[PDB]
């Protein structure tokens, strides 16, 4: 059966996903409660905790950014492992600050939580690392859309997007981070190893996939990344520099000239092709190599 | 400049598609429609395998993802998360996001394949006599209509036949009593048939 993240069964799930250690499946609610299940084994309760937005590391990061009201909402979930695995949550903190009337400012950060229980190591459910995103994420009020570990296992990719509110519009940012394994806990580095800007609002990233390099075998390269835009332009880029290497225009809808924009893309090994879903429900197979 | 080849397209549904997921073991594309249904399409001939609704609440935003490291499929709605895997070459996606019931009298969805249903019907009509049990007539009629609807699609495509499952909407205690009676009746006769497992 499908178990609810909480025993009440009334909270709605905000985000989910898997990272470099996908044996555990995470589910976070909008109120700040995360349940992790051991889906690799029999379906059981593996961890269950609630995120407090008033953590001392979060408080000092918000102090360094600028009663006191903080609302934290998770927008992406990932689990990073090389050394027990840890949960990486992409959170957004909204807080009232004086204008230099109070203004609600949003800041995206990354929170690291312990997963494996004790058999001064940190207890599960507590913060491990509070990574602060650079200034352009806070200036444009961006939110963490997607978190994906790279195929090498040493680098991580974060794709952002413009957070809607309940100028030059940007399509998001691609932040490539370097994994840190100096200590016994999986952590991240404060300095991003790559920053890529999407100056085109039309090129907002909606879905991404990674291509193994051995398909091309029929600074080391980090494979290829296939992304779908809002307008349906499939972009295949090298992960080393995020340069547009291959461009696929969206197809036209039948019976008209409307853009049948691609929304999501996957890789089909049997057809050996990029299978992408259109706006009208069609499926298109793109072949690589010739 | 990299070269990308286009060799056509296919039509899956007229309701639109939002998210995609591919299962590498069965070569099956799990297309997610905008109405919540999951359309399972074969990746070897262009013929669609099955359609599913996950037995979830109507209007929910179904999001499907695949993991090849653990070989598991995750379905996330606004309420709960379900995990599925391969079983005898098909995915049992009818009750993927079934909410666990709290009482014995709650109606539960029971999805079964074709060979198992045929063995159950053969045992119930030839070797098992459970006419005295509660809900026996309803289960026999449901099995009969499911098999007579499946057998028309059986002779056309084998993969679509195997992916097609019969969904019984029956109470939990009635089904439990029926299955216990089947187990007891097959155990007292010492007959090793395929309907017992």
């Amino acid at each position: 059966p499908a178990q609810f993240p909480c025993t009440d069964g009334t909270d709605r799930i905000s985000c989910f996903g898997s990272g470099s250690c996908p044996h555990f499946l995470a589910a976070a609610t909008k109120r700040g409660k995360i349940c992790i299940w051991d889906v690799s084994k029999l379906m059981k309760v593996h961890l269950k905790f609630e995120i407090n937005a008033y953590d001392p590391a979060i408080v000092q990061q918000l102090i360094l950014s600028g009663a006191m009201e903080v609302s934290l909402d998770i927008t992406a979930l990932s689990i990073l492992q090389q050394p027990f695995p840890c949960l990486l949550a992409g959170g957004l903190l909204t807080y009232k600050s004086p204008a230099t009337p109070l203004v609600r400012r949003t800041l995206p950060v990354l929170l690291l939580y312990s997963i494996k229980e004790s058999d001064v190591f940190p207890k599960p459910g507590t913060l491990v690392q509070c990574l602060r995103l650079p200034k352009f994420a806070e200036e444009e009020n961006l939110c963490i859309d997607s978190i994906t570990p790279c195929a090498d296992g040493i680098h991580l990719l974060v794709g952002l997007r413009t957070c809607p509110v309940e100028r030059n519009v940007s399509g998001g940012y691609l932040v490539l981070y370097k994994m840190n394994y100096a200590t016994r806990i999986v952590t991240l580095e404060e300095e991003p190893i790559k920053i890529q800007h999407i100056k085109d609002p039309q090129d907002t990233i909606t879905s991404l996939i990674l291509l193994p390099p051995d398909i091309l075998d029929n600074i080391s390269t980090l494979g290829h990344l296939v992304i779908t835009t809002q307008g349906g332009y499939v972009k295949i880029l090298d992960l080393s520099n995020f340069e547009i290497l291959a461009k696929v225009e969206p197809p036209k809808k039948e019976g008209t000239e409307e853009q049948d924009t691609f929304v999501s893309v996957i890789y089909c090994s049997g057809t050996d092709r990029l299978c992408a879903c259109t706006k009208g429900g069609e499926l298109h197979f793109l072949q690589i190599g010739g | 400049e990299w070269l990308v080849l286009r060799d056509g397209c296919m039509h899956c549904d007229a309701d639109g598609l939002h998210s995609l997921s591919y299962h590498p073991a069965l070569n099956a594309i799990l297309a997610v429609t905008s109405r919540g249904t999951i359309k399972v399409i074969d990746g070897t001939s262009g013929a669609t395998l099955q359609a599913s609704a996950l037995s979830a609440k109507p209007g929910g935003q179904v999001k499907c993802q695949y993991i090849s490291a653990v070989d598991k499929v995750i379905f996330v709605d606004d309420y709960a998360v379900g995990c599925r895997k391969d079983l005898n070459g098909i995915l049992l996606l009818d009750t993927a996001l079934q909410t666990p019931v709290s009482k014995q009298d709650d109606v539960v969805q029971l999805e079964l394949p074709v060979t198992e249903a045929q063995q159950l019907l053969s045992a119930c009509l030839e070797k098992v006599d459970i006419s005295s049990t509660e809900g026996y007539d309803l289960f026999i009629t449901q099995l009969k209509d499911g098999l007579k609807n499946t057998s028309h699609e059986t002779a056309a495509n084998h993969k679509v036949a195997k992916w097609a499952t019969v969904t019984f909407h029956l109470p939990h205690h009635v089904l439990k009593s029926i299955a216990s009676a089947i187990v007891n009746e097959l155990k007292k006769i010492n007959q090793n048939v395929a309907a017992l497992p």
């Binding site: 049997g270 057809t271 092709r273 | 060799d7 056509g8 397209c9 074969d42 070897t44 001939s45 262009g46």
Partner: peptide, 27 residues
Amino acid sequence: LKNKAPGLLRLCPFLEDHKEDILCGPV
């Protein structure tokens, strides 16, 4: 037999349907 990619003494008729794309046998 080579499995065909999806579109985007006499042998048995199923093998005759894919006789051109054969890759082993008959044995």
